[PDB]
Swiss-Prot record:
Disulfide bonds join 255-290. The keyword Signal applies. This is Endothiapepsin. It catalyses: Hydrolysis of proteins with specificity similar to that of pepsin A, prefers hydrophobic residues at P1 and P1', but does not cleave 14-Ala-|-Leu-15 in the B chain of insulin or Z-Glu-Tyr. Clots milk. Its EC number is 3.4.23.22. Keywords: Aspartyl protease, Disulfide bond, Hydrolase, Protease, Signal, Zymogen. GO terms for biological process: proteolysis. Residues 17-328 form the Peptidase A1 domain. The keyword Protease applies. GO terms for molecular function: aspartic-type endopeptidase activity. It comes from the Eukaryota. It comes from Cryphonectria parasitica.
Length: 330
């Protein structure tokens, strides 16, 4: 089997991407944030505190003839930015782009933090990291990908995120028309539950490539590119007027600037992020100071190849016995 679904930026800045997911019988379609940095599938629901729901589409398990409460099971998750949610657990039928899993754990939110309440376009998350990170207690549950793996033509999914444009998540096959040149595969460590890999270095604009190992995670659920302070300083030094602002919380730059590209290494191959991808617009409405898409990972504790990086590539998440990551230009 295979699946294929279109993923859509939630706003003009590509702050995140939503993908329609069918849950239950008859289908309830919710737009979820596919997140290769977490491993819980959770949804706004009929059980979510009313004051904490603000425009989202909810899952109503009582209206699903295939929903079964998973007795005793609860979940609670906190994300890298301080967001959180928690609730109870059903199993139900979940389909993504024609690909169906029966008995998928659907984590129903009783509580969500304000940042989720404020994002009216995100109805929940669908985690695609390794199932070892799943927060369901007392019996940990598997991700959608993990559940589907055996049935897929090939045990892979691919992320093809658009810049200010729709893109595609595919399950079970590699669309050879979706990228240019070849796919370069690189080793993954699953020891922290992430799609963790090592970039072979970077360049800024037309500058010479610096060979240097950069350990980080491929994370579709993170907006920006978070890299070591040395790397990030080297980038923003090439932008006149750019500065790190503690009050704003990162590097800012004059909105009148033209940004240089940023290249990262995958083995011997190179992925080029166009400068426009690194512009996240005014820090506040009407401001002439703009927020940068490349930021320091210092104090995060890990480097993150988020959407800024991933949307410049066709990315293969290979879930073979020994997982690997593939990157191609597009």
């Amino acid at each position: 089997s295979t699946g294929s679904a279109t993923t859509t930026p939630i706003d003009s800045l590509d702050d995140a991407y939503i993908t329609p997911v069918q849950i239950g019988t008859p289908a309830q379609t919710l737009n979820l944030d596919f997140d290769t940095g977490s491993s819980d599938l959770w949804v706004f629901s009929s059980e979510t505190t009313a004051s904490e729901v603000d425009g989202q589409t909810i899952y109503t398990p009582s209206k699903s003839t295939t929903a079964k409460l998973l007795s005793g099971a609860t979940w609670s998750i906190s994300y890298g930015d301080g967001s959180s949610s928690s609730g109870d657990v059903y199993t139900d039928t979940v389909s993504v782009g024609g690909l169906t899993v029966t008995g998928q754990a659907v984590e129903s939110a009783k509580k969500v933090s304000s940042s989720f309440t404020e994002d009216s376009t995100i109805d929940g998350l669908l985690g695609l990291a390794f199932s070892t990170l799943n927060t369901v207690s007392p019996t940990q549950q598997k991700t959608f990908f993990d559940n589907a793996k055996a049935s897929l033509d090939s045990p892979v999914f691919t992320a093809d995120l658009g810049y200010h444009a729709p893109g595609t998540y595919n399950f079970g096959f590699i669309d050879t028309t979706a990228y240019t040149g070849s796919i370069t595969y690189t080793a993954v460590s699953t020891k922290q539950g992430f799609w963790e890999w090592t970039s072979t270095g970077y360049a800024v604009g037309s500058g010479t490539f610096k060979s240097t190992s950069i350990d980080g995670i491929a994370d579709t659920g993170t907006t920006l590119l978070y890299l070591p302070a040395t790397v990030v300083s080297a980038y923003w030094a090439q932008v006149s007027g750019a500065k790190s602002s503690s009050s704003v919380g990162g590097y800012v730059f004059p909105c009148s600037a033209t940004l240089p590209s940023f290249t990262f290494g995958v083995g011997s191959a190179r992925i080029v992020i166009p400068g426009d991808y690194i512009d996240f617009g005014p820090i506040s409405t009407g401001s002439s100071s703009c927020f940068g898409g490349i930021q320091s990972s210092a104090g995060i504790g890990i480097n993150i190849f988020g959407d800024v990086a991933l949307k410049a590539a066709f990315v293969v998440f290979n879930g073979a016995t020994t997982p690997t990551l593939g990157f191609a230009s597009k």
